[PDB]
Design a protein around this motif. Sequence first.
Motif, PDB file in Angstrom:
ATOM      1  N   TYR B 300      28.844  42.042  31.437  1.00 48.02           N
ATOM      2  CA  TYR B 300      28.892  41.145  32.679  1.00 48.02           C
ATOM      3  C   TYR B 300      29.594  41.805  33.820  1.00 48.02           C
ATOM      4  O   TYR B 300      30.778  41.613  33.885  1.00 48.02           O
ATOM      5  CB  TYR B 300      29.296  39.667  32.323  1.00 48.02           C
ATOM      6  CG  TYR B 300      29.243  38.888  33.517  1.00 48.02           C
ATOM      7  CD1 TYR B 300      28.100  38.405  34.182  1.00 48.02           C
ATOM      8  CD2 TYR B 300      30.436  38.310  34.118  1.00 48.02           C
ATOM      9  CE1 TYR B 300      28.028  37.326  35.158  1.00 48.02           C
ATOM     10  CE2 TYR B 300      30.479  37.265  35.185  1.00 48.02           C
ATOM     11  CZ  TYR B 300      29.228  36.778  35.691  1.00 48.02           C
ATOM     12  OH  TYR B 300      29.186  36.087  36.808  1.00 48.02           O
ATOM     13  N   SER B 301      28.957  42.570  34.670  1.00 50.21           N
ATOM     14  CA  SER B 301      29.470  43.532  35.408  1.00 50.21           C
ATOM     15  C   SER B 301      29.939  42.966  36.762  1.00 50.21           C
ATOM     16  O   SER B 301      30.871  43.640  37.517  1.00 50.21           O
ATOM     17  CB  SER B 301      28.542  44.825  35.687  1.00 50.21           C
ATOM     18  OG  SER B 301      27.416  44.271  36.667  1.00 50.21           O
ATOM     19  N   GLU B 302      29.488  41.869  36.800  1.00 52.83           N
ATOM     20  CA  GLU B 302      29.897  41.008  38.210  1.00 52.83           C
ATOM     21  C   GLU B 302      31.115  40.125  37.864  1.00 52.83           C
ATOM     22  O   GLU B 302      31.138  38.914  38.564  1.00 52.83           O
ATOM     23  CB  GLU B 302      28.731  40.373  38.717  1.00 52.83           C
ATOM     24  CG  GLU B 302      27.686  41.177  39.444  1.00 52.83           C
ATOM     25  CD  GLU B 302      26.611  41.660  38.409  1.00 52.83           C
ATOM     26  OE1 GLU B 302      26.853  41.024  37.101  1.00 52.83           O
ATOM     27  OE2 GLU B 302      25.817  42.360  38.712  1.00 52.83           O
ATOM     28  N   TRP B 303      32.008  40.333  37.092  1.00 56.16           N
ATOM     29  CA  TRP B 303      33.179  39.700  36.729  1.00 56.16           C
ATOM     30  C   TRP B 303      34.124  39.649  37.663  1.00 56.16           C
ATOM     31  O   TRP B 303      35.084  38.441  37.683  1.00 56.16           O
ATOM     32  CB  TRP B 303      33.719  40.125  35.158  1.00 56.16           C
ATOM     33  CG  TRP B 303      34.640  41.349  35.342  1.00 56.16           C
ATOM     34  CD1 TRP B 303      34.050  42.612  35.064  1.00 56.16           C
ATOM     35  CD2 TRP B 303      35.995  41.594  35.515  1.00 56.16           C
ATOM     36  NE1 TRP B 303      35.248  43.398  35.265  1.00 56.16           N
ATOM     37  CE2 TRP B 303      36.532  42.517  35.423  1.00 56.16           C
ATOM     38  CE3 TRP B 303      36.997  40.427  35.597  1.00 56.16           C
ATOM     39  CZ2 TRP B 303      37.572  43.266  35.536  1.00 56.16           C
ATOM     40  CZ3 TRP B 303      38.091  40.774  36.041  1.00 56.16           C
ATOM     41  CH2 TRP B 303      38.594  42.065  36.005  1.00 56.16           C
ATOM     42  N   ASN B 304      34.275  40.398  38.659  1.00 57.12           N
ATOM     43  CA  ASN B 304      35.315  40.638  39.606  1.00 57.12           C
ATOM     44  C   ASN B 304      34.808  40.260  41.005  1.00 57.12           C
ATOM     45  O   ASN B 304      35.409  40.998  41.883  1.00 57.12           O
ATOM     46  CB  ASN B 304      36.038  41.832  39.650  1.00 57.12           C
ATOM     47  CG  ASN B 304      35.092  42.996  39.383  1.00 57.12           C
ATOM     48  OD1 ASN B 304      34.164  43.295  39.958  1.00 57.12           O
ATOM     49  ND2 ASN B 304      35.339  44.083  38.783  1.00 57.12           N
ATOM     50  N   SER B 305      33.840  39.363  41.358  1.00 56.14           N
ATOM     51  CA  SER B 305      33.232  39.309  42.572  1.00 56.14           C
ATOM     52  C   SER B 305      34.011  38.395  43.363  1.00 56.14           C
ATOM     53  O   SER B 305      33.873  38.262  44.611  1.00 56.14           O
ATOM     54  CB  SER B 305      31.843  38.892  42.507  1.00 56.14           C
ATOM     55  OG  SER B 305      31.677  37.693  41.924  1.00 56.14           O
ATOM     56  N   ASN B 306      34.496  37.110  42.742  1.00 57.18           N
ATOM     57  CA  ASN B 306      35.695  36.331  43.289  1.00 57.18           C
ATOM     58  C   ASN B 306      36.729  36.506  43.656  1.00 57.18           C
ATOM     59  O   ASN B 306      37.575  36.173  44.569  1.00 57.18           O
ATOM     60  CB  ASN B 306      35.469  34.891  42.573  1.00 57.18           C
ATOM     61  CG  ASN B 306      35.830  35.233  41.153  1.00 57.18           C
ATOM     62  OD1 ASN B 306      35.952  36.293  40.807  1.00 57.18           O
ATOM     63  ND2 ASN B 306      36.160  34.219  40.357  1.00 57.18           N
ATOM     64  N   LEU B 307      37.250  37.845  43.234  1.00 60.62           N
ATOM     65  CA  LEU B 307      38.564  38.427  43.239  1.00 60.62           C
ATOM     66  C   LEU B 307      38.596  39.152  44.501  1.00 60.62           C
ATOM     67  O   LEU B 307      37.777  39.802  44.877  1.00 60.62           O
ATOM     68  CB  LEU B 307      39.135  38.902  42.181  1.00 60.62           C
ATOM     69  CG  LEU B 307      39.134  38.161  40.509  1.00 60.62           C
ATOM     70  CD1 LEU B 307      39.459  39.088  39.590  1.00 60.62           C
ATOM     71  CD2 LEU B 307      40.024  37.143  40.807  1.00 60.62           C
ATOM     72  N   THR B 308      40.022  39.380  45.142  1.00 61.15           N
ATOM     73  CA  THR B 308      40.138  40.249  46.255  1.00 61.15           C
ATOM     74  C   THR B 308      41.268  41.040  45.846  1.00 61.15           C
ATOM     75  O   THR B 308      42.450  40.647  45.771  1.00 61.15           O
ATOM     76  CB  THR B 308      40.032  39.598  47.527  1.00 61.15           C
ATOM     77  OG1 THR B 308      40.169  40.532  48.584  1.00 61.15           O
ATOM     78  CG2 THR B 308      40.853  38.533  47.510  1.00 61.15           C
ATOM     79  N   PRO B 309      41.450  42.488  45.736  1.00 57.46           N
ATOM     80  CA  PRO B 309      42.522  43.077  45.828  1.00 57.46           C
ATOM     81  C   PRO B 309      43.441  43.113  46.951  1.00 57.46           C
ATOM     82  O   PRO B 309      43.098  43.313  47.867  1.00 57.46           O
ATOM     83  CB  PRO B 309      41.941  44.530  45.490  1.00 57.46           C
ATOM     84  CG  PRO B 309      40.547  44.662  45.218  1.00 57.46           C
ATOM     85  CD  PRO B 309      40.230  43.307  46.058  1.00 57.46           C
ATOM     86  N   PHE B 310      44.786  42.886  46.597  1.00 55.40           N
ATOM     87  CA  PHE B 310      45.464  42.586  47.847  1.00 55.40           C
ATOM     88  C   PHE B 310      46.209  43.702  48.713  1.00 55.40           C
ATOM     89  O   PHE B 310      46.016  44.883  48.089  1.00 55.40           O
ATOM     90  CB  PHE B 310      46.660  41.397  47.637  1.00 55.40           C
ATOM     91  CG  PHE B 310      47.322  41.823  46.180  1.00 55.40           C
ATOM     92  CD1 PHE B 310      47.402  41.083  45.045  1.00 55.40           C
ATOM     93  CD2 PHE B 310      48.362  42.712  46.258  1.00 55.40           C
ATOM     94  CE1 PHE B 310      48.078  41.423  44.157  1.00 55.40           C
ATOM     95  CE2 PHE B 310      49.048  43.153  45.270  1.00 55.40           C
ATOM     96  CZ  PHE B 310      48.900  42.216  43.733  1.00 55.40           C
ATOM     97  N   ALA B 311      46.601  43.456  49.712  1.00 55.84           N
ATOM     98  CA  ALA B 311      47.189  44.406  50.680  1.00 55.84           C
ATOM     99  C   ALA B 311      48.757  44.762  50.185  1.00 55.84           C
ATOM    100  O   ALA B 311      49.155  44.458  49.107  1.00 55.84           O
ATOM    101  CB  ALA B 311      47.125  44.029  52.042  1.00 55.84           C
TER     102      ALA B 311
END
Lengths: 180, 511, 401
Positions: B300-311
């Motif tokens: 399931y390659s879309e596992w990190n679509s809701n997350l955002t890597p922070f500044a």
Amino acid sequence: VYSLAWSNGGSHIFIGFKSGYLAILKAKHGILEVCTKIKAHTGPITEIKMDPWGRNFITGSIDGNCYVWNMKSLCCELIINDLNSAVTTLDVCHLGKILGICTEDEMVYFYDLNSGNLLHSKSLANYKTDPVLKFYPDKSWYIMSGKNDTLSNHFVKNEKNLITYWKDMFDNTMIEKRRK
Amino acid sequence: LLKKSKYELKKYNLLVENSVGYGQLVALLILAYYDPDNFSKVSAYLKEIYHIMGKYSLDSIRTLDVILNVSSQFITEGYKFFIALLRKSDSWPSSHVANNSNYSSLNEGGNMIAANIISFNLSQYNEEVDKENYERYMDMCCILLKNGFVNFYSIWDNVKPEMEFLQEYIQNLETELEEESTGKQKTQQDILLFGKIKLLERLLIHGCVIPVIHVLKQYPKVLYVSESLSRYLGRVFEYLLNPLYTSMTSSGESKDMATALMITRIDNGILAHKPRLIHKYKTHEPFESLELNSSYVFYYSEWNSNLTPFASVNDLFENSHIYLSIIGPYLGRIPTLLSKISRIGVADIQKNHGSESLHVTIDKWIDYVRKFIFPATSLLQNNPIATSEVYELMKFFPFEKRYFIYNEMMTKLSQDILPLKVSFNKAEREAKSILKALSIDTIAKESRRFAKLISTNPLASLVPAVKQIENYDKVSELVVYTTKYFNDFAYDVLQFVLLLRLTYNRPAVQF
Amino acid sequence: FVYNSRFNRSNPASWGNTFFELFSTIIDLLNSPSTFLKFWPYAESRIEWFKMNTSVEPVSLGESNLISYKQPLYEKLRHWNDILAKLENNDILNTVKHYNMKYKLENFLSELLPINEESNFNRSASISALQESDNEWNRSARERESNRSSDVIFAADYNFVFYHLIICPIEFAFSDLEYKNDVDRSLSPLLDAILEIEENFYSKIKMNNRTRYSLEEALNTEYYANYDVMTPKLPVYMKHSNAMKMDRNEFWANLQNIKESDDYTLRPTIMDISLSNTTCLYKQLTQEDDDYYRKQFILQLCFTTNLIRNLISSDETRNFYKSCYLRENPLSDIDFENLDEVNKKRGLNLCSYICDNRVLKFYKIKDPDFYRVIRKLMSSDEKFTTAKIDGFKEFQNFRIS
């Protein structure tokens, strides 16, 4: 400077000192400058190896200590609990699965690189060697030094790899299931 | 006969009442997963389903059970057909679609008839057939929770065990830890393999953080059930951290993308060079691997679509009060995450050296390293390299505020948290077993055994060592011989313990 | 207007009977199944207005104040079960819009009622007698005199197992010994004639992609390979080619315009097995190219063999089918009354031979994906049969927050 190694690409050099520092320095075309400098062990870094798939690299030292550092983030990833003696020689396979450690208790071990589990262990105590493991670079045989005084034997099979050994063990079992 | 032939609905609820009508429903779903064309004719397969269960009077509850039961065998390759099929049928909640990504709407849900079949089917694990299909069924129900097909609390409330029965098994386990800090065996192996606990960590593998943060903030000792809950939550925090760590170590880590490559295989025909040949497989295990010739990836390659890597640094200090406070002293189970945060700190003091904002930058990193980095260092077993990376951040501190942290962690050891207190009692029990069999002939190899126990946590292990120096003789010549294998962290704690024994309240002069 | 002005009534219960009364006027006055599917999107979005029975405030979600023998649903459920039986009797003149109307209306009554309503889950378990994959207009005169070929003895042997083993399994288990040898003398040639021509379908897939795995190993002789025998989703040249995709998608697009038109609105199902025509029944189950007609016959035979096991061995399942045959006619000509103990041991050997020895061990090696679909539908049918005996009372403990 105790040991050196080239990376698999051929653009960085790994240098291991006596105080336990590990320096990584570029070689671009003619420039030779220092990139990082991390303190790895509490002792002289004895030997440095590389993964043949280019994932990680392995360091050994004069305490009973052997890490596996990955090459992307440059942080330690797996630690082998080898509290016996000082690791003298160190090498990996060509598939990148067997790791051969040989300490100053005159005993050889064989681990995994993905896990840190033990596979086999031979004790060679009556000799007076500094025994040298070396794996072949194209097939999965090895040449372990020291048979009587300072010699070299090499340990063979009829199949070259581990992959053509599993593929022969599978086809011999399949005949029995095609027998019943 | 009045309420059988006038009021009873004429529908067929089992697979034997229509062996002809249910036999064509399964074979139409076997066919739909073997098409190359599966996104252009979604609506050609629904209009053949509605003509099958109108002709033969099939149930509408048992039919949605057969669709979810066949489509869990084909979830590894086709999970975009299965989602796009359910969004066009008339069982998708069109106006009740409400999401699980918010905090106030984990009760506002949709399709409570499918929530009645899912929670009934996750509760059965007693036969030898559904112990093997459990990982595929549970993985399918976590894609339906991402999209908004089922409410979250409608599955959490109605799946086995019970929250009164879970809460008494934790307290039976917390007692077993306090005894070492100084029917059930078949039930407990069915708690951590099936049920609520297995559901809580497949949600954290796929994408769901907000329903798992809300549970562990309510029952914070849902840890001490599985040691997997702190591994998979360190997979989500390490994805958010990783763009920042590559840019802070700017020039080095950007060319580290080019240093990772392998060696070709060189055969001796003409002495030519050929690359290595591998092949992909998509598996259900979250961590990427590589065998002798096969590499494995997560399906399931879309596992990190809701997350955002922070500044850069101002967003790390806000998002660590949420994630790093759930696993408090459990960050020391992920030693590679404890090494990454400590290199952000050294790289931020040195670039913001200046002359103006330096007394402010140090003070911001004092309170961070003492709230949830130094408690994590005490739950470590054999890591002299993970403890040296932490100390290189503490070399930038004044030694008054470095001696404050050392004494407090010997005071809030006991009065505070339990997992730190079981760890301190394991190091003291091991340091008191080495020092008894300490002879002048055994220090060839007991010098290396003793020096990794000190290098990992000295505050637990050095205090029984200097207490056995002033009691008997002949042990000063053995401990000073072991000091050639210490690190720079255990050299700064040893000076603190010696200042502790000299000002300790005792009769200095004899009677 | 009836829903909005419900506080201004002289009674807040006098709108629940006015809303069901005007809604049953619309369904009678509406003149066609084409106009039914045009109106019915109104009655699916406004479905939470039907459950709030004589209460001005809405029910939450999943709760419904509707029980089947009280004043709203007492004379309407008797009336909407006539339309649903009117539309079932003409089994010749049914178009495809008559089968879509029967689905959208029966689905509406299931959501209205709770999941535990005695008239909702088919409580008196009656196996259907109208499961007919047959056309009378495709059948001329039903000839039975020219018994020459194998086309007329295979299709007369499929039509023997079907009419009294599959459509009625309860009359097979509680029967004599001369009745269950006449099935075994008709099922042992039939199951050997099908599993031989499904051994040749799976031996063309095995020998296609085993030679080219022996050909990777010679050409680029760097790497050995053992992969699985799987579906190579598109070969290498059908994967990325927009000239082959675009003309293929416009073949399926004008096959749907035939099936969306108002001319060919009278047609069979795509997965349909014929029974009347003796020529097409042999031509569907023998061609080793499709293999979706020999998987239905395996699924049909595993569904009704799983019941003979569960009803001979267990005696609470055997006691549940007591009540459903003595309530509908106490003076019963059909009889099941006792043990039939020699038929118990013999009939349990027609179970483990069919679906445990021959069928499941065949597909364990050949097709591993179809082996798990059979194996899981076997076990999930027993969680629903057992919960029917209790009265579906493990679906009433569902709680709402």
